[PDB]
Symmetry: C3
Amino acid sequence: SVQTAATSWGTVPSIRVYTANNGKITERCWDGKGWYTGAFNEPGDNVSVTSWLVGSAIHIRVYASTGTTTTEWCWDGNGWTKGAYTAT
Amino acid sequence: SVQTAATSWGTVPSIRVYTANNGKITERCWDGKGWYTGAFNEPGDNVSVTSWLVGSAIHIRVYASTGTTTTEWCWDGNGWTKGAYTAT
Amino acid sequence: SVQTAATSWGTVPSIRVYTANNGKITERCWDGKGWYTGAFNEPGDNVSVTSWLVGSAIHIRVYASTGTTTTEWCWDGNGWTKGAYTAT
Ligand SMILES: OC[C@@]1(O)OC[C@@H](O)[C@@H](O)[C@@H]1O
Ligand SMILES: OC[C@@]1(O)OC[C@@H](O)[C@@H](O)[C@@H]1O
Ligand SMILES: OC[C@@]1(O)OC[C@@H](O)[C@@H](O)[C@@H]1O
Ligand SMILES: OC[C@@]1(O)OC[C@@H](O)[C@@H](O)[C@@H]1O
Ligand SMILES: OC[C@@]1(O)OC[C@@H](O)[C@@H](O)[C@@H]1O
Ligand SMILES: OC[C@@]1(O)OC[C@@H](O)[C@@H](O)[C@@H]1O
């Protein structure tokens, strides 16, 4: 079936749910006022996530895996880009 | 194999581990004094979870997936019910 | 594909990413100065993780599953050992 990963922050809260479905990962977002589709859209068969809130900034790390390759995607306030993570 | 998801809160801590096994999700609970089987029992092949503790209240969201359908289950102090999440 | 689980703590942050790949779980670690391979290496086809930071101590629980058996692995400052979790 589809595979999901979830994270949340604050007291509203904000929630992010990532779904790997048919080799693509998409993102659904809640900030207290309805679910919406987030900016994150990248390939992957499996997803995990962690996040940490510091001051006014949310930092999110999404680990997207296809085959034996895992790509880290980073949100630090300015869109999603690949991070330095490697699996070694 | 079976697939799990875990969350924890406080300093004891309380831990919740959700296991999707043979199309059913069950819940094991630790509150500092032994593991026990929790109230959560719903269908699903895949599970993720997030939780947030505010004051005296734990809020838990469990995302249960079968095929391409994901159901959000909500704990807000008074049993588990379906939440408004949709995958779009 | 490979399956991952992630957790993080503090403001640096420290991040731990567990990967189940070909029946083995390994751990990659970030403490602010590059990724490295962690001490955790145990069998499993599926992994989840939760952690909680209290004072100067990180506590990590990794749930490693093969078939219908889930083993809890505990970090409490002094290496990884099996915890009391059972699935019942
Ligand atoms: O729209 C809200 C948003 O910016 O929140 C942070 C990330 O989750 C983004 O992908 C998302 O679009
Ligand atoms: O700011 C991005 C970054 O440095 O954040 C910490 C880790 O997630 C790294 O892999 C990543 O490149
Ligand atoms: O028994 C403890 C309990 O109420 O804690 C909150 C939820 O995890 C419930 O499913 C669980 O039964
Ligand atoms: O109180 C329940 C609820 O509003 O909590 C926030 C989100 O999890 C929603 O999908 C959900 O319906
Ligand atoms: O090296 C850092 C380390 O000690 O951090 C705590 C655990 O994640 C360990 O497996 C890891 O080796
Ligand atoms: O200190 C280890 C331990 O007591 O921590 C809390 C739970 O993770 C238990 O299963 C585990 O044996």
